[model samples]
Target: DSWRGWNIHPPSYPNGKALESFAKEVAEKTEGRVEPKVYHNAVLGDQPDAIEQTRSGALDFANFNMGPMGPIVPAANVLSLPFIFKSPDDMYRIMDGEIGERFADALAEKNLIVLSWFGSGARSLYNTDHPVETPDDVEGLKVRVMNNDLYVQMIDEMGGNATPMAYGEVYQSLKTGVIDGAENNYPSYESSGHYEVANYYSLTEHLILPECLCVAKASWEELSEKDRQAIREAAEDAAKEQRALWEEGVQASKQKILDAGVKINEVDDKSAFQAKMQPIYDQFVQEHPELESLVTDIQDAQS
Candidate 1:
């Protein structure tokens, strides 16, 4: 049976291209026994809708960000917590080992099987109004954030009036002053053309979201042991290539946006911003037992 996959990024996007590569690898590795056909650019549906389809077996596979997955699997919320990982290396160390497996196990309870994790890059703040050097700078600014409650709360806690809007409408929202700014990584900040309207790109680097390649549990169960191994191997191979492409893409996108005259500001004191999230941390620890343990382990884990 051929797997039907859906992703929100265009085919040229690093992760989208990686998904295509995964399909090709799976086809070859399984001797064409289990083919894969992937749709890009939200061609099939939005991330939330695609996830629902995958969960119900209407779609075979999907690549979803951990942000949206937080509500679906409570344990996944640990990834959405501000300053969860110290750096990219710290993130990979935890997610590529026992901690990641534990999160995957939580997804299994939601009928999703993790094949591999892809990097979404570090998200920062971009605004039409002005540069954000401190929490006070963000005061009274209306910022658009993902529809996740944690994200909304984080923005509000940091002095911004958080507004949740459809991802596709952000460009116009920025252009018309409906929103003061939005947060995202360089690739998305450039690719979505939000920089053209929102000139000030501030390096808050608040969220480093991980994307997961997942298959419906029913689909995974039907595969033979040999076929399952081949598929997993294909996913691993695709992830390695994807990570390299993503890192390069990040640099290239940042340069392109900078050259285009987007005013870039880097904050020297990230700790000032990080310090404001103590309440968020305290609240989450009390609410989630798994997140408490996961947070403790990652905090202690070394790269």
Candidate 2:
């Protein structure tokens, strides 16, 4: 049977590319016994709906972020804990280890069999304000977060005014000073021209996110061991290739931002930001039992 896959990024985007890479590799690895056509840009549906469709076996595969996975997979939100990752490199290592396996196991129960994780890049603050070296530095600046209360608290904890705004509107909002600045990954900042408006891009990584490339369990059940192994190998190859894409993307993004005259500054200490998220974590565990234990295990996994 031909398989259908879903991705919420454009065909040119790395997310889409990685899925395509897996689609091609799997067919070759399985000698055409397994084949898939990847649909990009969420033409099938949005994130939440895609999750359900994939879980229910209406879709064969999907590459979805940990963002929307939280509601279904409890450990996904634990990945969002502020400063849970020391750096992007730390995150990549952490995910491949038991930390990621924990997530994979939880997802499998939801009927999504994990193949590999794609690095989604770190999101740091970029603003039109002078420069931010510490949480207090952003005291009066208006910052934008993805219309989520968690992010609202994230910015608010930094002493900044957190304005939940639409992604499409952020660049113009930054330009006109309707909102002072926003936070996002380096590649996105460059592509959106946010560098032109938010000249100061701070280098404090509260979290570096990842997404899963998974096959639906309904489809997984029908596959032979060799077929699953073949798919898994291709998924591994695609993950590494996608990481390479991110490495090159960030380099190019940095180059573009530099030429655009964006001031890039490093925030050496994240203790201040992480320390401030205690309340958020406190609130987190109260709602989900897994997050607290997951957070403890994740921190222990760091070294």
Give the distance in Å from residue 161's predicted Cα in candidate 2 to where it truly belongs: 4.0
Reference-based TM-score, model 1: 0.97
Q: For candidate 1, lDDT tens digit of each residue in 160-231?
A: 889877677888999998889999988889888999999998998898888898999999999999999999
Each prediction's RMSD over C-alphas, in Å, is 1.2, 2.7
> Which whole-number lDDT from 0 to 100 does residue 30 have in model 1?
95
- The residue pairs in collision within model 1 are none
Report the number of clashing residue pairs per model: 0, 0
Model 2, stretches more than 4 Å misplaced? Answer: 140-142, 163-179, 286-290
Error of 1 at 52 (Å): 1.2
User: Deviation in angstroms for 118 in model 2?
Assistant: 1.4
Give candidate 2's TM-score.
0.86
The whole-model lDDT of each prediction reads: 0.88, 0.84
